[PDB]
Design a protein around this ligand. Structure first.
Ligand SMILES: CCCC(=O)Nc1sccc1C(N)=O
Ligand SMILES: [Cl-]
Ligand SMILES: [Mg+2]
Length: 192
């Protein structure tokens, strides 16, 4: 029933990414991180998260982790599908990613799903157990969309992360660049 409105949202985002993110250039690539990080910052504003970690991984995957509630997994009556899957299939970031993965820690369970260009590659599954709550999102910007550059710039991430931790007092926000195994760089911000 409601599966059809989700697929027009993806085509739209992907024909006119600019309308959603400003550009398909370097600046838009970095907007993808800001979208995901803002969700984690809302977990902390809600009172649940206090730590957010942003990692630039090998082959320019971005990994964002928070220790908030974990995205819900309960079945939605209208879609018939887990809440996380609904949430992530209307995500601009996901649409503009050749690959995206989620891990949710919730209900003493670790759940996993992956997507390409916004489309679920398999059903939500329980892959492990946990005594923490939170959410991990890893995504790789789509080279068929980001046809100029899919390489992140550390100082641009660093700059904004620091401003965000300064604005949002009490949240520990860490940035790490792991792309060169031989020289890993980390900056961790925590105000008050
Ligand atoms: C109780 C609702 C929690 C939720 O939707 N959280 C979301 S939606 C997308 C990201 C995240 C996150 N990082 O917690
Ligand atoms: Cl749940
Ligand atoms: Mg948003």
């Amino acid at each position: 029933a409601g599966q059809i409105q989700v697929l027009e949202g993806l085509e739209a985002v992907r024909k006119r990414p600019g309308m959603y993110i400003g550009s398909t250039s370097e600046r838009g690539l970095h907007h993808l991180v800001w979208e995901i990080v803002d969700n984690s910052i809302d977990e902390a504003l809600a009172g649940y998260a206090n730590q957010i970690e942003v990692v630039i991984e090998k082959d320019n995957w971005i990994k964002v982790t928070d220790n908030g509630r974990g995205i819900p997994v309960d079945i939605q009556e209208k879609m018939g599908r887990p809440a996380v899957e609904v949430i992530l299939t209307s995500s601009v970031v996901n649409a503009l990613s050749q690959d995206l993965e989620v891990y949710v820690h919730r209900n003493e369970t670790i759940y996993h799903q992956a997507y390409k260009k916004g489309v679920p590659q398999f059903d939500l599954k329980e892959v492990g157990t946990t005594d923490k709550t939170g959410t991990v999102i890893r995504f790789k910007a789509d080279g068929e969309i980001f046809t100029e550059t899919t390489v992140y710039n550390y100082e641009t991430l660093q700059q904004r992360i620091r401003e965000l931790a300064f604005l949002n007092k009490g949240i520990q926000i860490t940035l790490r660049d792991e792309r060169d195994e031989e020289n890993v760089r980390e900056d961790s911000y925590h105000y008050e």
